[PDB]
Amino acid sequence: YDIQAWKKQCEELLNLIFQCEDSEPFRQPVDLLEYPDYRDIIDTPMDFATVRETLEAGNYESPMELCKDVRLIFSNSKAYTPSKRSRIYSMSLRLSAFFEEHISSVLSDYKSALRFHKR
């Protein structure tokens, strides 16, 4: 029932994600010079370095907020993909499945801890 345990759990999961080859395209913001129409399609850029920095700054209150930003990385890739068969989109779907498999217990444990706190 540790209300703070999510933060280190999220740091560890981000470490795993940075070790995954599938995260390569999502470790920094999209350079417009490679993809000059990116901001015509994507309203809110997001990447794993921005997520880690936000976490390490103490600017997430809950793992739900972190989860919303990570899911934005994946929705941006689905919105920007010219094909569902894209290399970089296919990497996003595998990384998304890995992230969802690992974040589920982090969320469950946090929400259980908060319910216990307010019991």
Ligand X SMILES: CCCCNC(=O)N1CCN(C(=O)c2ccco2)CC1
**Min. distance of Cβ 62 from ligand X in angstroms?**
26
Q: Does 25 bind ligand X (CB under 6 A)?
A: yes
**Min. distance of Cβ 89 from ligand X in angstroms?**
5
Q: Which is nearer to ligand X, 25 or 109 (CB)?
A: 25
Instruction: DSSP for 26-77, please give it.
Output: GSSPPPTTTSTTHHHH-SS---HHHHHHHHHTT--SSHHHHHHHHHHHHHHH
Which strand (E) or helix (H) includes residue 16?
Answer: helix 6-19
Task: Indicate the SS3 state at residue 85.
Answer: coil
Q: Residue from 27, 68, 94, 115 that binds ligand X (CB under 6 A)? A: 27
Q: Does 46 bind ligand X (CB under 6 A)?
A: no
Q: Please check whether residue 67 is in contact with residue 48, taking contact to mean a CB–CB distance below 8 angstroms.
A: no
**Min. distance of Cβ 109 from ligand X in angstroms?**
30
Span 66-95, contacts to ligand X by CB under 6 A: 77, 80-81, 86, 88-89
